[PDB]
Structure formats: structure tokens, C-alpha cells
Write a protein that binds this DNA or RNA. Structure first.
Ligand SMILES: [Zn+2]
Length: 66
DNA sequence: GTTGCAGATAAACATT
DNA sequence: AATGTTTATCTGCAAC
């Protein structure tokens, strides 16, 4: 259900992963983690239109073993 | 057999 | 410079 889903905390409609807040308020992957760590609302000065991207860290993965 | 969704890690950025 | 802090991307599981 991304149709109309807007981050309740920061209104962004672009998110890498949609989270759900303890209140049931849709939030973007960033607000969910920041909010969970600090549990406070922050100004939208950290937001950008599209999503930010970065070089994929080392291909570290659950690779193997058992 | 494929898709979708949720959650967690590690890296890099900013600050001091 | 190191640490603290932050966010993007990866994978897995369940159901059909
Ligand atoms: Zn948000």
C-alpha cells in the first residue's frame, strides 16, 4: 500500500523501506530508526526529494556457512 | 517457484 | 583524527 502512504513524521513519499510506528502511523525508513533511537520529532532539513544512495558496502552477506 | 514486506548490519558523514 | 550518529542496501520468511 504505497498509494498515498506519506511519512507521518516527515511526509516524504520516497522511502527505501516503509516502517510502522508504535502508534500505527506510517513512517519512512529514516524516521523509524531516528525516532526509535531518540523518540523525538526533528525538522525536515535532513530531507531531499529523491532517495539518497551510496556505494554498496563490501558485499558482506549472510554469504555462507550453515 | 515467485513475489512482497519487515527487520538488522555495517559503512560513511558530520561533529568536535 | 576518533567517536557518535545516521541512513541505504542486503537478506530472509510466509503465503499462494
Ligand atoms: Zn520520515
Amino acid at each position: 500500500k504505497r498509494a498515498g502512504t506519506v511519512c507521518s513524521n516527515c511526509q516524504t513519499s520516497t522511502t527505501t523501506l516503509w516502517r510502522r510506528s508504535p502508534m500505527g502511523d506510517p513512517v519512512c525508513n529514516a524516521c523509524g530508526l531516528y525516532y526509535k533511537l531518540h523518540q523525538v520529532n526533528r525538522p525536515l532539513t535532513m530531507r531531499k526529494d529523491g532517495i539518497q544512495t551510496r556505494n554498496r558496502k563490501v558485499s558482506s552477506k549472510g554469504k555462507k556457512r550453515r
